[PDB]
Design a protein around this ligand. Sequence first.
Ligand SMILES: [Mg+2]
Ligand SMILES: [Mg+2]
Ligand SMILES: [Mg+2]
Ligand SMILES: [Mg+2]
Ligand SMILES: [Mg+2]
Ligand SMILES: [Mg+2]
Ligand SMILES: [Mg+2]
Ligand SMILES: [Mg+2]
Ligand SMILES: [Mg+2]
Ligand SMILES: [Mg+2]
Ligand SMILES: [Mg+2]
Ligand SMILES: [Mg+2]
Ligand SMILES: [Mg+2]
Ligand SMILES: [Mg+2]
Ligand SMILES: [Mg+2]
Ligand SMILES: [Mg+2]
Ligand SMILES: [Mg+2]
Lengths: 120, 41, 85, 91, 55, 95, 140
Amino acid sequence: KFTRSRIPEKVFQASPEDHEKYGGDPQNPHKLHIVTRIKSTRRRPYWEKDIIKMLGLEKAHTPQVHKNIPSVNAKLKVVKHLIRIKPLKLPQGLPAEENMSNTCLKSTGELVVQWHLKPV
Amino acid sequence: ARALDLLRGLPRVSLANLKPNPGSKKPERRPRGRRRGRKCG
Amino acid sequence: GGQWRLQQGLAANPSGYGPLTELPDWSYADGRPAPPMKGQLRRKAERETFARRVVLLSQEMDAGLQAWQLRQQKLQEEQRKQENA
Amino acid sequence: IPGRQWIGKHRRPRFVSLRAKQNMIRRLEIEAENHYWLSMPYMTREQERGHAAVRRREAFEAIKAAATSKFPPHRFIADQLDHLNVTKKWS
Amino acid sequence: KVEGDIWALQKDVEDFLSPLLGKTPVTQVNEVTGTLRIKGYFDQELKAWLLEKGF
Amino acid sequence: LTYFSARKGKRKTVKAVIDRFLRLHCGLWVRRKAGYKKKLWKKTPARKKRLREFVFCNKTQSKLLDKMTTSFWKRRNWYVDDPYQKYHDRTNLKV
Amino acid sequence: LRNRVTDRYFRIQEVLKHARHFRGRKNRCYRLAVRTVIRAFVKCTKARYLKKKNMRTLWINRITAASQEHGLKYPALIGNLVKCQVELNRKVLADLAIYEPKTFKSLAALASRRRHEGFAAALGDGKEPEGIFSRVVQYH
RNA sequence: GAAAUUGGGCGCAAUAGAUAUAGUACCGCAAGGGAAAGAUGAAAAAACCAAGCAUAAUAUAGCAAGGACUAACCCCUAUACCUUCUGCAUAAUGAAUUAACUAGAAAUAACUUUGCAAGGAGAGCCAAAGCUAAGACCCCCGAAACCAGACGA
RNA sequence: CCGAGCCUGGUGAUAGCUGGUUGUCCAAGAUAGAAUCUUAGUUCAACUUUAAAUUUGCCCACAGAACCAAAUCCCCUU
RNA sequence: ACCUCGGAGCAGAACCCAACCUCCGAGCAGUACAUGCUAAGACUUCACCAGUCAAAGCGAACCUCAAUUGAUCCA
Ligand SMILES: [Mg+2]
Ligand SMILES: [Mg+2]
Ligand SMILES: [Mg+2]
Ligand SMILES: [Mg+2]
Ligand SMILES: [Mg+2]
Ligand SMILES: [Mg+2]
Ligand SMILES: [Mg+2]
Ligand SMILES: [Mg+2]
Ligand SMILES: [Mg+2]
Ligand SMILES: [Mg+2]
Ligand SMILES: [Mg+2]
Ligand SMILES: [Mg+2]
Ligand SMILES: [Mg+2]
Ligand SMILES: [Mg+2]
Ligand SMILES: [Mg+2]
Ligand SMILES: [Mg+2]
Ligand SMILES: [Mg+2]
């Protein structure tokens, strides 16, 4: 029959080759994902149509900050074929309440906290 | 009360001014149209 | 051509962020600025509740790490305050 | 093809172009990066316990307080007497 | 049978029953008819309070 | 049932409801269990004690028998020595 | 007949005023008109998706026609006007080619200079300084 | 399914309303069935709008249109509608078309809105917040038959 | 037009069967089953809809579910 | 040929799961005669009807078996 899929823990154990291809650190990892749905929930089972509603990814190509914790990551492991996961990197820090209204999330995955529309 | 003071500026209550309490009269559901009748319920 | 724009750090759509769709489309001829676009007020409000979510979710982790860093010390002096008498 | 080209015992064959091979490959590389970033969590499962229970419990209380505040609206004498204005004339 | 300012009564009941509930009770004045509809059973608790006011 | 009688113009009641069920004024219907006097020799004493019981009806069974009887059978009945007198009122519901 | 319809004439003319330019009896007989006036209105709203499709296909066929006059293909012009951050759309580029062919000759010169700067950067792999027209303008 | 007992029109106005101008014409041996329709004006001793055609036949190509367009067509897009169905462009059903006629009728219980309130109701009835009043839900055509009484060799 | 005339009446016979069921706009909305002279139907459940009251629902982690494969059940966190 | 009930396979591990699918059976027998009375909490053959289990208590003493069955009508 067609059931849900238990993906083994070996698949989510990154190799030291993988830390060189994608620019991640094993020690001190990132805190917040940027989840973006890139596939439809149609022609997918109902246990994936509801997980996508649980993460807020009902719209395609709309990013969403989620924590990098093993309970949010258990939901992202169900629908990893539907989404695209990238780390939210913060070149400057998290925005204060003065820099809250001048932020922008870039396509590199970084959240700049001062966003003028002037060239360098 | 004060509502009898509001009636002085308002025009006179006649038989062309009356209206039931909103909630009393429900609309009739008669089977004409696209929704309310094709096989009519 | 949007796989080149993703390498420069721009949005893959040119209608995303950037100077084309965030600057004001017009201004008064004397020089007074225009009232802001309804799509710019809606985008800046949607970018704020995203940045509020970065501030909220990051602090819930850091306060959640310190609580475990205290509960693993309160577990520890419970081990040493029974080793007497 | 005997009946209904895409169903049954004898179907018409469909073949895989360079489009369809490259479309699956660039979807397979988004997937391999997905397995990378899910392989390094910030907290273990014992650190994350109850770290947002005070916010999750207050979230439900504001849904629960919105659910148990369903009641009819106030009915004003200035809505009943404004229907007298339909016969407001000039003089 | 409320006659007068029903809105002043509705505030006084919101100040009377909210210690008895914890939350402020959700009411509905009917300024045309002159009633007040409080959610929940406070029949004996509002009869004893409207007697101390001398009504 | 007869929704409109031809002599008076009222509802009739199914009289097969009346000889079988008892309506309490709270809204519950009370019935005896089927087969409570049939073939008692081949039944265990636990099964025989289950049959000698007045049991309540379902929600939909109570709404079906409420339609089958008129409003005469839904009134307060202040009998002298009713054994089911204590069961008419409903105490202590939280719905 | 207590109240029968007195205004049925004007309900027929709500439909029959849209059918006046038809053929056959669809312009006269009401029973045949509503099955075409409805069908003339569904096609009127389903062709708001085909006007934007058939205009862009026309603009692509008028840019491809004019880029071939300078020896460019269509993907060699659009792909390298993006790389110079010249964000002109298909409507203006097909209306530059007709009405301003000197400016369109300058956009075909620019998209071919960037193309040659893309090849010369690609054959000379390793770190080489960038091309002159290949320098991006960053916004912060 | 009892009894004691109690005591002129918020109508139709010539396909409507009677079948009715008439039980006539017509039909049937008979019993019986049974129509249609008229519009001047004070005085006759005084236009404009259905279908259908004509004015005015037709030009490559295709659900009869739409996007359009300088331009009717040429170009591009588009497998009538209803019903029935797992599923109909379906070569499944129905329909020439116009005008007129032709199809959701109601109960206890609930709900909504008032009145009054441990009572409500203009006797009867209900009542452990109820009770009274209102509002709001229940179609059209069609058998072969069965029986009673006449009329027919 | 005779496997039982014809006409009127009961008669607006009955039909689980076919056909038909007429203004506008919006909203929610599809498939476990059981009984039945029943499988062309209906009643109950399930699903669906509305209104109301309340407090948990879904996703789930360790641990746990028997002897003669994919998974599920249960399940705090989130 | 079949129509009700039960055991096993399909249906491998909570439950469920069709078939004119594959295989076995049942319509009883035996032993007690407190196989007395009552009553919390539950199970449930996918509804209902029926079916199950049961602590405490009273009273005494010091059921086995998978199925082994049949509603209402008041006589
Ligand atoms: Mg229709
Ligand atoms: Mg074929
Ligand atoms: Mg009498
Ligand atoms: Mg007539
Ligand atoms: Mg004409
Ligand atoms: Mg064509
Ligand atoms: Mg088709
Ligand atoms: Mg046909
Ligand atoms: Mg048919
Ligand atoms: Mg035909
Ligand atoms: Mg003779
Ligand atoms: Mg009939
Ligand atoms: Mg919808
Ligand atoms: Mg049938
Ligand atoms: Mg749980
Ligand atoms: Mg059950
Ligand atoms: Mg015991």
